[PDB]
């Protein structure tokens with residue numbers, strides 16, 4: 001593993017919110033385990049747990065990212081996405097975003113989201129690369145309660161290929 005987060009130590013570490021949402025390491029809920037990272041008070045689809053991973057990785061490499069996700073309120077099914085937030089030339093005002101994977105989850109059931117990703121080369125000027133989870137993109141005016149349900153992540157892992 002290049003990077004692993006199982007939350008079993010109860011530490012938030014470098015995980016962060018993307019807007020006004022709340023992150024919390026909870027106990028009593030986890031993927032085959034007692035702890036996981038809960039994201040709640042989401043009021044946009046793009047709210048979700050984020051972590052910077054570029055320092056763990058070699059620029060110009062391909063790595064395998066996976067994590068487990070679960071939600072337990074609202075609709076019978078819901079899509080969750082795994083996405084990347086990228087920063088180039090330390091320009092915080094010109095970020096880009098890409099979805100790397102997506103699965104449909106069933107209420108109460110843990111499921112794995114995974115894909116190979118490319119870490120852009122040094123010569124791109126890449127200066128941040130953050131993985132995050134969210135619900136499928138759409139804008140503020142179209143946002144509904146099914147979109148902004150709380151959800152859990154666990155067993156986040158990045159591996160060499």
Ligand SMILES: O[C@@H]1[C@@H](O)[C@H](O[C@@H]2CO[C@@H](O)[C@H](O)[C@H]2O)OC[C@H]1O
Nearest residue numbers: 018045046083097098099134136137
């Ligand atoms: O799926 C991606 C969304 O997560 C991304 O949403 C942005 C996230 O950061 C916030 O600071 C921005 O306001 C918000 O638009 O949009 C692109 C999409 O691919």
Ligand SMILES: [Ca+2]
Nearest residue numbers: 006030033035
């Ligand atoms: Ca765990």
